[PDB]
Amino acid sequence: GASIFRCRQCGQTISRRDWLEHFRVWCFSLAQGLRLIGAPSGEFSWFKGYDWTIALCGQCGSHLGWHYETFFGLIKDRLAEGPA
């Protein structure tokens, strides 16, 4: 029952276990339904050698995590998990 990951606020589909905790952050190789905003930043990056960009939910605008450059680092408590 924890195969698909979704925006907690509106339910937009974001990623899946096939693409997949370290706040607790989940790293995914691929994601959908986000909007990546702004230019990359290195400041306080949790992953050595990566810059990040803010990742919002494309449906409701909730801040779900970051895109790193590649992979996506998403905040566990901003997501809902459920079955495929």
Ligand X SMILES: Nc1ccc(C(=O)N[C@H]2CCC(=O)NC2=O)c(F)c1
Tokens of 53: 């960009």
Contacts of 18 (CB under 8 A, 6+ apart): none
Tokens of 28: 């995914």
Residue 72 binds ligand EF2, judged by CB under 6 A: no
Residue 32 beta carbon to its own copies: minimum distance, rounded to whole angstroms: 17
Residues of this chain, 12-71, that bind Zn ion according to CB under 5 A? 12, 57, 59-60, 62
Helix (H) or strand (E) holding 48: none
Q: Which x/- pattern over 39-68 shows residues binding its own copies (rule: CB under 8 A)?
A: ---xxxxxxx--------------------
Which residues are near ligand X by CB under 6 A? 1, 43-46, 52, 66
